[PDB]
Amino acid sequence: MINAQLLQSMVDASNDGIVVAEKEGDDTILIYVNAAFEYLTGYSRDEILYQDCRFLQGDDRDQLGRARIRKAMAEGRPCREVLRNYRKDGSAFWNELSITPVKSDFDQRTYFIGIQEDVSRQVELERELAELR
Amino acid sequence: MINAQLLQSMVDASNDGIVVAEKEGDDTILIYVNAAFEYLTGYSRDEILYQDCRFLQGDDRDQLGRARIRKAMAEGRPCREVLRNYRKDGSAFWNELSITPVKSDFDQRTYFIGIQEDVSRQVELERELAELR
Numbered sequence A, B: 001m002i003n004a005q006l007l008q009s010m011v012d013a014s015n016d017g018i019v020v021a022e023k024e025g026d027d028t029i030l031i032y033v034n035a036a037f038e039y040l041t042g043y044s045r046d047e048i049l050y051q052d053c054r055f056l057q058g059d060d061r062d063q064l065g066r067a068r069i070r071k072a073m074a075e076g077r078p079c080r081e082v083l084r085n086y087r088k089d090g091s092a093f094w095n096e097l098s099i100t101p102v103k104s105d106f107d108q109r110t111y112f113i114g115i116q117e118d119v120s121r122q123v124e125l126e127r128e129l130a131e132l133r
């Protein structure tokens, strides 16, 4: 195998944003974030941790990605949806969320792992393709 | 923090393909793969592990993504490039590689973490945008 401490060091250092969260009913509470996620969000580790990251949505909460994420998490299936989130400075970015539900048989509670990426460029290009079509 | 054993369990179960590799000169040798990477490649864990994953390129080795990956790994900077890889059955897919170099100060050798995704759909749509333009 691999030393879990080494794997943790690799995850903390990945330029991709990696987050882990635990379920508390309707809400999903974050338990781990990496430095890449801090850079993408602008918020700090203590500021982000131990809450649901729906705060990144802010007032812009009428987004279809929310519902498909909620539906997938309830159905126990992975999902990959793009939402418009806002940084601490107020900058708006398109974030692709790859959320995968995991069940710890020993704990009998549910955790979620998410990998994020600023795909604002891809969204703009596909919008350009749409207006051409 | 978070229990590294739990983080390892979350990584093993992510639907995104996560791999870790160690550097041996020009070659980079894999030390960890997850079940998602097995599904994307079709090859098995024992078949994939402990080798450079350039084998996914096969005869199609005249690809510009190779060089930019090699340049970035040498420069100690992360990279995100798309390459055409081939599964065990011979199926061809466009794989986006997010490779992040990590240096263990204690070990003084270099490891790499990569997150993969079959972006064949995105490549086809951008090709369609190009022929429209």
Ligand SMILES: *[C@@]12Nc3cc(C)c(C)cc3N(C[C@H](O)[C@H](O)[C@H](O)COP(=O)(O)O)C1=NC(=O)NC2=O
Residues within 6 Å of the ligand: A019, A020, A021, A026, A028, A052, A053, A054, A055, A056, A057, A065, A066, A067, A069, A070, A083, A085, A095, A097, A099, A100, A112, A113, A114, A116
């Ligand atoms: C958040 N990324 C993210 C990562 C994980 C691992 C989970 C489980 C969830 C998110 N996420 C979605 C948000 O937390 C809510 O779960 C979602 O809106 C559905 O529930 P709701 O309809 O709010 O009750 C994130 N959303 C974001 O906006 N940005 C992220 O990076």
Ligand SMILES: *[C@@]12Nc3cc(C)c(C)cc3N(C[C@H](O)[C@H](O)[C@H](O)COP(=O)(O)O)C1=NC(=O)NC2=O
Residues within 6 Å of the ligand: B019, B020, B021, B026, B028, B052, B053, B054, B055, B056, B057, B065, B066, B067, B069, B070, B083, B085, B095, B097, B099, B100, B112, B113, B114, B116
């Ligand atoms: C491979 N994904 C991948 C993941 C990591 C963590 C690394 C370090 C490298 C790759 N990778 C690239 C390949 O192994 C070579 O490093 C690359 O071609 C540059 O060196 P070379 O020019 O061959 O000497 C992968 N390539 C793939 O084709 N598919 C993957 O998923």
